[PDB]
Amino acid sequence: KLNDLCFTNVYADSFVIRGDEVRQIAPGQTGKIADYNYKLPDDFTGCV
Amino acid sequence: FGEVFNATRFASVYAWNRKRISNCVADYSVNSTSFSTFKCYGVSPT
C-alpha cells in the first residue's frame, strides 16, 4: 500500500552480509552482528 | 560448558543425556562457537 502515501525523510541503508545471518537483522534482535556492526531500533518503521 | 557442548559423543534423542548443574557462577557470552539456533523462551537471553 506504499505508493498511496507521501513519505517523509526516506533513507535506504545499504551494505552486504553473509547468507548464514539473513535472519539476524530485525527490530529487537541480538547477537554479534546486530549488536556490533548494525543496530535496528525497536520502534522501527521501514522495509528490509 | 566446554565438554558439555564439545565432547566425543552425545546420546540419542529418545535415549538422551541429562546433567545436573548448581553451585557455580555462570555466563552466556562464553555465540563464540557458531550456533545455528539460539532461542531463549520466557527469559531474555541478554
Q: Are A27 and A41 in contact (CB under 8 A)?
A: yes
Experimental resolution (Å)? 3.9
Within 10 angstroms of residue B37's Cβ, the number of other Cβ atoms is 4
C-alpha cell at B15: 535415549
Q: Are A31 and A23 in contact (CB under 8 A)?
A: no
As to burial, measured by CB atoms within 10 angstroms (0-12 exposed, 13-18 middle, 19+ buried), residue B17 is exposed
Question: How many contacts (CB atoms, under 8 Å) link A and B?
Answer: 5
Record: contact B45-A32, CB cut-off 8 A: no
Helix (H) / strand (E) containing A32? helix A32-36
Give CA–CA dist A12/B37, Å, rounded: 29
CA angle B22, B26, B32 (to 5 degrees): 130
A31 close to B (CB below 8 A): yes
Experimental method: cryo-EM
> For chain A, what's the residue count?
48
Q: Are A40 and A29 in contact (CB under 8 A)?
A: yes
